[PDB]
């Protein structure tokens, strides 16, 4: 592995919240979500599956969700 990085703390703590995110998922889990009757069931199962927490989770476009299986496509307004 590597041994050092460029880093900074985010002084003033302010960070943007994304307007939207797109997720792409394998057919099995996709259908298992799409057939759910309610939004919060989808949200909570995604939270369980990927350990995503609202407000706190940092994300980028093209981020992986799981190799072979799912990925994060694009983000708005910022990438």
């Amino acid at each position: 592995t590597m041994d050092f990085c460029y880093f900074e703390p985010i002084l003033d703590n302010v960070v943007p919240v994304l307007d939207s995110v797109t997720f792409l998922i394998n057919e099995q889990l996709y259908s298992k979500l799409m057939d759910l009757p309610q939004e919060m069931q989808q949200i909570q199962f995604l939270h369980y599956k990927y350990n995503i927490n609202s407000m706190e989770t940092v994300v980028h476009s093209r981020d992986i969700l799981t190799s072979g299986l799912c990925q994060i496509l694009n983000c708005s307004p910022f990438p």
Partner: protein, 100 residues
């Protein structure tokens, strides 16, 4: 033109490779006007490079320009001159003998 319209009548639809207009999830419309079409188009263009300038629809031969009697008789009646032709038979009358 008749052959072309028959040929076009054979080529009259996208007989193969229809548009891949798959619809994803109805995204949670907390805001915006659900204008999914532009984002879907941008995504599919980026992911597939549909304009890679190699694929073709090829729903017809672009050949086999058949020709036939079938429409030739649309000649119907020609709008020809010389329906009245007294001037032109007088034209012949100038050379009734070999003079000039």
């Amino acid at each position: 033109l008749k052959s072309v319209h028959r040929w076009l009548s054979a080529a009259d639809q996208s007989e193969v490779v229809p548009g891949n207009d798959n619809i994803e999830y109805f995204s949670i419309n907390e805001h915006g006007r659900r204008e999914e079409n532009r984002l879907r188009l941008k995504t599919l263009l980026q992911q597939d490079v549909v304009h890679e300038t190699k694929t073709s629809t090829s729903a017809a031969s672009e050949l086999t320009a058949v020709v036939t009697i079938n429409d030739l008789l649309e000649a119907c009646q020609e709008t020809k001159p010389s329906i009245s032709t007294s001037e032109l038979v007088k034209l012949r009358g100038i050379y009734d003998r070999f003079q000039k």
